[PDB]
Amino acid sequence: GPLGSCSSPQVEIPTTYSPEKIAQLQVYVNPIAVARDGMEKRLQGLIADQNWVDTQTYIHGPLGQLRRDMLGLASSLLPKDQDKAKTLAKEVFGHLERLDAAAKDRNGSQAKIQYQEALADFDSFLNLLPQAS
Ligand SMILES: [Zn+2]
Ligand SMILES: [Zn+2]
């Protein structure tokens, strides 16, 4: 009889990134680093100036693709980090929606807290990258 095994191949978990995998990941990191830098520079200042109208446009425009980008990055990580990274992508989106609502409410204290919480979870996510090790 046929010699091949019919059992599930258990090609186990990689726990380091190959250059391929790292170049592939970089395709998502690029726009995500742009968004992280823009949140630090421009969005911060817009909140500080109580410029609520431009705050909201910033979230919808420059950050409008960030959920999609982070979710694509997350699904590309080592299996070990995929779920945590996905959960963090969803947390950042959540704080940006709470941010947009604070801008609508012209509540600068609430806006600053959601901005900080969005950055804390964004930086948590970024710390899963081979860049932070
Ligand atoms: Zn959060
Ligand atoms: Zn909105």
The domain that holds 65 is classified in CATH as 1.20.120.290
First to last CA, the chain: 50
Ligand at shortest distance from the CA of 58:
2
* DSSP 8-state assignment for residue 9: P
Cα 26 to averaged position of ligand 1 atoms, centre (Å): 24
Chain mean position to CA 84: 11
The CA 56 to ligand 2 mean position distance, Å, reads 6
Range of the domain at 108: 1-133
User: By what technique were these coordinates determined?
Assistant: X-ray
Separation CA 132–CA 37 (nearest Å): 16
Report which bound ligand comes closest to the CA of 56.
2
Burial of 72: CB neighbours in 10 Å, binned 0-12, 13-18, 19+: middle
Closest ligand to residue 117's CA? 1
DSSP, collapsed to helix, strand or coil, labels residue 4 as coil
Distance from Cα 30 to the centre of ligand 2, integer Å: 24
Please count the structural domains in the chain: 1
